[PDB]
Amino acid sequence: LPHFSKDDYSPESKGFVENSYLRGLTPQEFFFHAMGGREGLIDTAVKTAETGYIQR
Amino acid sequence: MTTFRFCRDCNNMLYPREDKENNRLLFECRTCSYVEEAGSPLVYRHELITNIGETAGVVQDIGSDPTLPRSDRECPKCHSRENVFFQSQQRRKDTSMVLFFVCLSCSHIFTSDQK
Amino acid sequence: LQDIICEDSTLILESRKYEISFGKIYVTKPMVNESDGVTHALYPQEARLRNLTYSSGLFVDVKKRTYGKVFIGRLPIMLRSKNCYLSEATESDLYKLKECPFDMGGYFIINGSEKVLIAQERSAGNIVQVFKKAAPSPISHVAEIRSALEKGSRFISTLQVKLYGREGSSARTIKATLPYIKQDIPIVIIFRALGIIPDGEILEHICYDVNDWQMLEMLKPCVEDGFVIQDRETALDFIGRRGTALGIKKEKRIQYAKDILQKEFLPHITQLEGFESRKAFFLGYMINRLLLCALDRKDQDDRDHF
Amino acid sequence: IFVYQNNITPSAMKLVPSIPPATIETFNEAALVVNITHHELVPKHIRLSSDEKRELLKRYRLKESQLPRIQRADPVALYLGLKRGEVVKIIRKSETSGRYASYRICM
DNA sequence: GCACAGGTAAATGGTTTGTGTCTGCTTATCGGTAGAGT
DNA sequence: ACTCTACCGATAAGCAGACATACCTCTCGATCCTGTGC
Lengths: 56, 115, 306, 107
Ligand SMILES: [Zn+2]
Ligand SMILES: [Zn+2]
Prior knowledge:
This is part of a larger assembly, with chains A, B, C and D.
Chain B: E1 15-18, E2 25-28, E3 70-71, E4 83-87, E5 99-102, E6 109-111
Antiparallel strand pairs in B: 1-2, 3-4, 4-5, 5-6
Chain C: H1 2-7, E1 18-19, E2 25-27, E3 31-33, E4 39-41, H2 44-49, E5 55-61, E6 65-66, E7 69-76, H3 91-96, E8 108-110, E9 113-115, E10 128-132, E11 139-147, E12 157-164, E13 173-176, E14 185-186, H4 187-193, H5 199-206, H6 213-225, H7 232-241, H8 250-263, H9 275-294
Antiparallel strand pairs in C: 1-6, 2-5, 3-4, 5-7, 8-9, 10-11, 11-12, 12-13, 13-14
Chain D: E1 2-4, H1 10-15, E2 26-28, H2 29-32, E3 44-47, H3 50-60, E4 69-70, H4 75-80, E5 87-92, E6 100-106
One zinc ion (ZN) binds at residues 75, 77-78, 80, 103, 105-106, 108 of chain B.
Chain C binds a DNA duplex through loops.
């Protein structure tokens, strides 16, 4: 993200959410969680069609 | 070929050849002869691994980048408590995670490979 | 609108010369033509209710010469635009005109239906991008630029430079892809066709550092492949012979190659004379970027970058 | 049975099927270094005689084409020297029954 | 007064980001022997 | 003994073909004319 420095391998910068849902999420981990959810949704969307064709 | 031999006349480069009778390798151009002794044992060098201390262009404006992280590593020569560090610029997984520190006072590049 | 009107406005039909020379263009307020022929201002509410089109007529100047204002069509007007009646309307005026003050506009009213143009996402032009092809394919890296003219007509000419041969294969050569030519051409031949005859100048253009021996070693097969061509004329006629299927003699092949290089070879840098140096420098920069990608000194370009 | 060392020519292969009614089999030392039938995934293969094959076909009321097929170039078929039309009995262990017998016909 | 019937248009040049995974056909390329001498 | 060239087999490598879960709901457009006739 533009808010981090170059060559930063710390867990916070690489997508570790040290907070909880009750506590709340910082913008960076919020963006990371959104990316993970988008990846999951895309995975299910492809998988349902693939398994349907395989079942047929 | 670590270096390329260019013909003094014209601007083409020189092919490798052997004098046979003189038993001495000579470089010759094609547009013009330009025969010389060609006193260089190097005919071809092949490289298979990344060069040690590749670093980068390290321009004098390397300290003007706001995205470069800063540390407090001691400078070996000028003994400064400020520098900027970055990893190797090789674009594969074979390179290690060593850090190259560049001092903005004396422009000296020193690594953290204590080993 | 004015740029398109003035782009190609003069046409000559054949001391008998006929010219059109279209003049300035302006856009009037939205009006509607009734059955009896009368005209009146067309408001968005009336257009929506009567299933009409919220379009405004536009006129151009002819200025016919052999050696006034004329109607050209109707252009739909986006709501709440500079030509819309609601741009300067206040809250009271909007209420009087039976228009919701909370409406934001930005849509076209055609045939009484509201239409919104969805933004289309496309890759940026005039950008050099390098990607690595599949392992089974004989191509290792491709460097292509989608050159196009901004103010001029849409061209979209793609010049692709590919590195033939895999890393294991010793037949490492670079061949470009000129438009309308159905066979790849060596880079050295193209460089010679631009007037840069000596090989040292070619190497100077390709690489800006004399200590990078790996790049020179990779370029050595290319300069060896460029041995056959030695002057500009032979390169030009070789390029011409690679175009048309020998329909005409080779005398016109040189002219055809020169014209294609002056027009279609990277038609974003320039199109007039004196293009040889700039185009040669751009080609050298592209080759340098491709070799840097090959030398794993840079990462493959990401197509998802915004 | 002929066991060559490294390679054999196509003309040499053509020469082999020319001796009636005898049979000539060619094998490779590399393939014969390790016994295939000793593997844990290879079940027992038993060749059936003509009378046994006829009895099986009559009892199950089946045609020759209505049986599982095994290629003549199969390593087990080459090991047993199966001819065309021969039926081999296969006994394998099962996780639902203690023993299971299956039959395949060489094609 | 208005209708009536053939596909006469573009020639061109030209297009598009990032679809893989087998399938079959058609070449190009690589070894290997047979018609026999001094 | 292998030269002067022929069919045998065994691959590489380019050229196209087929196709992508299932169920329903709603709205919205388009289904021809210009040169030629007396
Ligand atoms: Zn010279
Ligand atoms: Zn220092």
